[PDB]
Amino acid sequence: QWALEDFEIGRPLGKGKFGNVYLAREKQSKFILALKVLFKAQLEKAGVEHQLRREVEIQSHLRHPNILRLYGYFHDATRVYLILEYAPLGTVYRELQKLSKFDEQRTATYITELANALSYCHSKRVIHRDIKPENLLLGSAGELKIADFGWSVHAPSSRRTTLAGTLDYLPPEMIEGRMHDEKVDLWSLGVLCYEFLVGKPPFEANTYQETYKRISRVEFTFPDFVTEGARDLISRLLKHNPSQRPMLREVLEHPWITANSSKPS
Ligand SMILES: Nc1ncnc2c1ncn2[C@@H]1O[C@H](COP(=O)(O)OP(=O)(O)O)[C@@H](O)[C@H]1O
Numbered sequence: 001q002w003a004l005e006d007f008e009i010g011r012p013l014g015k016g017k018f019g020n021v022y023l024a025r026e027k028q029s030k031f032i033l034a035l036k037v038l039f040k041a042q043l044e045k046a047g048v049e050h051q052l053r054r055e056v057e058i059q060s061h062l063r064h065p066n067i068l069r070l071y072g073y074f075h076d077a078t079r080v081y082l083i084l085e086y087a088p089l090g091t092v093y094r095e096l097q098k099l100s101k102f103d104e105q106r107t108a109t110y111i112t113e114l115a116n117a118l119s120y121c122h123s124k125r126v127i128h129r130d131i132k133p134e135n136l137l138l139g140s141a142g143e144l145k146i147a148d149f150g151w152s153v154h155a156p157s158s159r160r161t162t163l164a165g166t167l168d169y170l171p172p173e174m175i176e177g178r179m180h181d182e183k184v185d186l187w188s189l190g191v192l193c194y195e196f197l198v199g200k201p202p203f204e205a206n207t208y209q210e211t212y213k214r215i216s217r218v219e220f221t222f223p224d225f226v227t228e229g230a231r232d233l234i235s236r237l238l239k240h241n242p243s244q245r246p247m248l249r250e251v252l253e254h255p256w257i258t259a260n261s262s263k264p265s
């Protein structure tokens with residue numbers, strides 16, 4: 001169906017490990033979108049064809065305002081191209097670099113939007129497993145959208161692919177290569193809430209080895225300015241034991257969230 005000829009390409013929107021993403025416009029309709037470019041040689045070398053297929057299958061069938069749309073794909077002997085919804089206000093990651101810290105209203109609103117999208121995902125036993133600021137994008141009204149479903153699976157699951165970069169958002173069961181389910185995304189949710197309010201992730205360290213130790217022991221502390229409500233929610237999500245982490249409805253109905261969010265469930 002679609003091929004490269006059907007699009008005029010524009011400015012680079014960002015870069016990932018495999019992803020090189022560009023603004024583009026379809027020639028006959030003038031529809032504006034984002035083109036995620038992947039190099040076949042690099043995909044084959046790392047052996048992640050299965051992740052690519054998963055990304056397309058899962059993201060094209062999900063429909064939710066807080067989840068980024070994937071419309072289709074094509075390829076041409078050097079490259080694979082994913083056709084995505086364009087997010088005009090950028091990543092949450094860039095916004096955090098701009099402001100250093102978010103206030104409680106901004107943080108609680110993002111958490112609600114995230115929890116709504118994840119509740120929709122989990123109702124199909126889809127778990128994302130790679131929730132972090134560079135994979136959260138912003139729509140034209142500043143609403144959060146989850147993206148990058150390349151690491152997603154159906155629960156329960158083991159891990160067959162090598163962990164690449166940072167350990168900062170991953171739970172103990174995940175880094176220890178044990179068995180895991182939906183509760184992994186709730187741990188990541190707790191890491192995010194902390195990083196939004198403080199400006200850095202709770203287990204951050206100078207080395208891989210020390211970061212691993214701080215995660216498996218759940219060693220974090222709060223600066224003075226973090227309020228009691230925020231501490232309560234965060235302490236509930238960052239539990240070593242998966243089964244002790246709350247349900248998403250409990251997050252959406254937490255008093256600190258309801259007192260500070262500007263959006264509903
Ligand atoms: N639909 C989009 N709209 C705007 N920017 C995007 C979009 N998709 C990706 N980006 C930018 O490109 C980066 C990499 O995209 P991603 O799909 O996360 O690639 P990877 O799979 O390599 O992580 C993102 O962190 C973001 O900066």
Ligand SMILES: COc1ccccc1C1CCN(C(=O)C2CCC2)CC1
Pocket residue numbers: 040041043044049052053056073075080
């Ligand atoms: C249903 O197959 C796909 C769904 C989404 C994306 C890609 C595919 C196919 C399988 C992957 N591939 C390739 O050339 C591989 C990637 C290294 C060569 C393109 C065709």
Ligand SMILES: [Mg+2]
Pocket residue numbers: 016134135148
């Ligand atoms: Mg990514």
Ligand SMILES: [Mg+2]
Pocket residue numbers: 016148149150151
């Ligand atoms: Mg990816």
